[PDB]
Design an enzyme around this catalytic site. Sequence first.
Site, short mmCIF file in Angstrom:
data_model
loop_
_atom_site.label_atom_id
_atom_site.label_comp_id
_atom_site.label_asym_id
_atom_site.label_seq_id
_atom_site.Cartn_x
_atom_site.Cartn_y
_atom_site.Cartn_z
N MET A 1 -13.51 15.26 10.04
CA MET A 1 -13.77 16.32 11.00
C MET A 1 -13.11 17.66 10.65
O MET A 1 -13.61 18.72 11.01
CB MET A 1 -13.30 15.88 12.39
N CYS A 2 -12.00 17.62 9.92
CA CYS A 2 -11.31 18.84 9.55
C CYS A 2 -12.01 19.60 8.42
O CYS A 2 -12.14 20.82 8.50
CB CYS A 2 -9.87 18.54 9.15
#
Lengths: 529, 397
Positions: B204-205
């Site tokens: 997700m980052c």
Amino acid sequence: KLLKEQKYDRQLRLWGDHGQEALESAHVCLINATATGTEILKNLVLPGIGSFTIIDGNQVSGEDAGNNFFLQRSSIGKNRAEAAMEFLQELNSDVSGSFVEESPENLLDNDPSFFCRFTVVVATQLPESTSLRLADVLWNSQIPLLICRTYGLVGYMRIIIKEHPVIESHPDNALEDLRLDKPFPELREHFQSYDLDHMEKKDHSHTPWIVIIAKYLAQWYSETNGRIPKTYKEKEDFRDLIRQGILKNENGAPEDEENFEEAIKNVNTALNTTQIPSSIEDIFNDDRCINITKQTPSFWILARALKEFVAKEGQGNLPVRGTIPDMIADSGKYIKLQNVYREKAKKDAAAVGNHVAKLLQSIGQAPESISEKELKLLCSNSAFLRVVRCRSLAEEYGLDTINKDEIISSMDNPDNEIVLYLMLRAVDRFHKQQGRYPGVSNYQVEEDIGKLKSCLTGFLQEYGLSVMVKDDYVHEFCRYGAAEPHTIAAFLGGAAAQEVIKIITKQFVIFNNTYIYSGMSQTSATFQL
Amino acid sequence: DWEGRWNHVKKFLERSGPFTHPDFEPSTESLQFLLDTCKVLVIGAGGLGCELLKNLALSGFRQIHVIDMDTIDVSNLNRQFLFRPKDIGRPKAEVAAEFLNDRVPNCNVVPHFNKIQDFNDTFYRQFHIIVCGLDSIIARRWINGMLISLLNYEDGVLDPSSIVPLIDGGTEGFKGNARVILPGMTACIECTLELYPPQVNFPMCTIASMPRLPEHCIEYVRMLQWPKEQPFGEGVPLDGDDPEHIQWIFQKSLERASQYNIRGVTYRLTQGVVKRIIPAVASTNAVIAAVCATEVFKIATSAYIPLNNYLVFNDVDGLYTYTFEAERKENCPACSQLPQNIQLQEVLDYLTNSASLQMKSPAITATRTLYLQSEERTRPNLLAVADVTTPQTVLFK
Ligand SMILES: [Zn+2]
């Protein structure tokens, strides 16, 4: 057109639009339509070979109908080629099928040049004599040939192509061309631009690992002067040197920096990567590469060009591939780093273009008989080029050309699959001597064991092969009764089909001679016979 | 049925031989016993499925059941030869049995337009052998748990007759693998997880703040932009096979790639990423289905000894097969007779992020449930775990 793109999506992702093109323009020829042949063919029609022609001169038998998915009970008695095409054609409408209710011998008698109308010829279930006869014709005609036989639980496959060179070989897990050991100017410049010591923290933890390792490799270098090739010492100390650069938190203990971890886990395969592969050197030093003429194939021209480049602008190195693996970093730094390699790859490709043009000049072949696409692909795979040259079938069968070295050595292991090869040869002798195969009938088995054991000895002594063949194999091969078990034919049919696609598309790398499969143990092996 | 129909199969059932299974007894009846009684369940009509039904049918198997929840799609046609353009849209299991029953005279293929999770013990118990050729690891681990739960232990001693053989095959481009699993005797799917879950799910980052590859851009639009905005109607989900949907994902992805100077976004690439497309050809499926079918036969007839469990096939450079015996982990979460040993919202992580378990969205229960994420109020709830990765209940002490 749009229909095809959708239909062939899963495979286009493997050999691209260009492979599909090569595939859709080909015309393959299948000899007999037994289970082995319809299985190979089905794997060619589905993906979409341009067209095919079955050549069987026999009629469907109760057993043919029983082990073949492309022959029904209703076809019992009719021509096998005709009936197989009916069902195979149903597989893909974009493929144009055809046949000839004649046999290979007859065709070899009358119109031999007949097979010259094919991209590749697949012969299945052929007896020794027809195989050699056909092999000779196709060889002089330079027509690619694949011979496949299913016998009991054994699968056999032999490919014959004088010369098969390939650029786009699709190597699995190749070493990335990072050039950390022989950095080009622009890459040196780029690394200097980094100052790990004095730099914010977020950027520190978001620096490409190539930069990290680059940083530390210069430190370790300006001191000792070594390059770090001693795996669990130099490389292990180096990993530590890198692990000591990891910023410490407010409490003192080092923090979590995935990028440095990545640098570390990569030192093992990142310090040595810029070196010309054995296979390339062998291509460079080959006659077709050193002595160019007017007939020299575009491949060898591009091969020589690559060589000239390695001599000048390359400085003893192949052109920069241009790509790098993904790696935890901020977008900006990653893209900037990648553009350096990309730009560099573009520079190197242009240089290679020149050498090519200059080569086409002192040949007067043409101005651009080589699309620039062929040039960009060649520079991307310069380290992955491959050339395969198969022996002829004649060399294999010759008394002085036979590769007894390979056969003798392999037999050290009484169970090497090379025995299956030997048994096949002997079984064939049993078929010429007797006019039938051994063990076909439940009542012949026991008696055939002795006759076959004898055909073997004759075959061996004849070529001077002093190898021990366990009795079990003779018995096992009589027990087979020449059967063509479907699942065994299916295995060989997938394997053979893909080798044919490799030929047509010129893309991956074909086996170099003979592949033998044993359904009994589910083991296999390749040999250069 | 007709003259010499099974001539190619008979010989391995009517004749004695040097490499025969220790318990093999040549019989002129065996084949009929095979055609009339051996019940085989094929899981998946996709991938290896079509190739498995042909192989089994031409090998003397007649009582075959196929399970598949999928519908025929145009992309299936490059290798799922039992399907034709006219079948596009129809249930795969259906058309498959249909085709086979008509091409192989007396085969009695029974379809089931279901997902394997729709069935339980009672159903799977009806089979002698189960062949799995589906695509997901979630499915492989699920059927792996079902068969193990069928194992009946007597005072710590496994009852061999409660063992249901599982033959599992897979394919990826010009690579594939086949294996024989004997629940409670051999290594099971979970015993060698260090080979099954290797899949990708972009962090997700990186996707939200550090795109570097075109795939990251596409990933972003699919996993974040589409949910936020709702291009095709409030509440409407993303349809991977819908052309207008891909077109939208494509345009928005290009826009994101533009902003971060990322090249490469393409329509073909968008499709591949939205559907997690795995390249596939007929040839590799034929090879793997062939090995699996052969082992199914062997196990049903004791003609020969089974694959010493795990084979790999690779067609990229030349060609080769490689086999080794995967070992049974004595601490396996799925096939070990004993309850695992540990050391609440911190143990849920251990059942997830961990490697030995790699469970997906588990659910713990005290000697009383707690977090059965499957119920949105099951969060305010925030040992006997449970999961979507298996039919059974893993006992953790
Ligand atoms: Zn296990």
